[PDB]
Design a protein that fits this description.
The PDB classes it as ligase. Keywords: Metal-binding, alpha+beta sandwich fold, RIKEN Structural Genomics/Proteomics Initiative. It forms a monomeric assembly. The chain is an alpha+beta fold. It has one domain (11-123): Roll (Ubiquitin Conjugating Enzyme), CATH 3.10.110.10. The protein is 32% helix and 21% strand. It contains three helices and four strands. It has helices spanning 12-23, 88-104, 111-122; strands spanning 28-31, 40-46, 60-67, 77-84. The protein has a four-stranded antiparallel sheet, with helices on one face. Helix 2 runs antiparallel to helix 3 (111-122). The longest helix has 17 residues, at 88-104. It is elongated.
Length: 128
Amino acid sequence: GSSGSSGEEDWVLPSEVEVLESIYLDELQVIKGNGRTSPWEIYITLHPATAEDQDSQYVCFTLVLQVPAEYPHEVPQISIRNPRGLSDEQIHTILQVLGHVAKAGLGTAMLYELIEKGKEILSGPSSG
């Protein structure tokens, strides 16, 4: 039997987004949720800017981020929808890599970082 709570409700998640939007006005979408014990959702479109000469230049994936309530305390579950162009193996490699980055940026704004990787990963070395 334990209850009782009071104080100011703060949240960096919604504090950073305001800054991100300015940059990713449309590039990135954010579904506000009046920060009511509800996990925020963020979408974005990324493409590999490396495949120029090689074949199958067609490849894109929608990065979906679900920021829970704990956040930043908790890392946003990184998911991928409509994973086209990329293979099961690749897709996973994108979930694992990002997965960590999330924790590496705990305690403060991370959404920014996460997104960054979303690009780097897609891109790779030069081979022909």
